[PDB]
Amino acid sequence: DKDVKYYTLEEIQKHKDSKSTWVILHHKVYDLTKFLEEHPGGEEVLREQAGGDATENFEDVGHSTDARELSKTYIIGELHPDDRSKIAKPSETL
């Protein structure tokens, strides 16, 4: 609790539409369900999130007076590094 938690890959891949939004950056999972209603966009608005790769364009526009990044308070925890990176456990030797 409080600090980042370890979410699973099946739990983050279960929120299709419902109402909130689980955007992922690199490891932290964002639950921006309040941004989905605070930023009239539709479903995917945080950095597009659909077919990108790098993270150069973090935000697009729609704040001006707000220069600080919003991706920090609208988070819940991180994803399980096991399915995130690659736990290819070798046979049993170096």
Query: Using what technique was this structure determined?
Result: NMR
Residue 13 corresponds to which tokens in the numbers above? 């891949």
Instruction: Provide the strand spans (E) within the chain.
Output: 6-7, 22-24, 28-31, 75-79
Cβ atoms of 72 and 30 closer than 8 Å: no
Binding residue ranges for heme: 39, 63
Secondary-structure class of domain 1-94 per CATH: alpha beta
- Residue whose entry in the numeric block shows the structure tokens 């600080």: 68
Cβ atoms of 80 and 8 closer than 8 Å: yes
Binding residue ranges: 39, 63
Show Cβ contacts of residue 6 under 8 Å, excluding neighbours closer than 6 positions.
Answer: 77, 78, 79, 80, 81
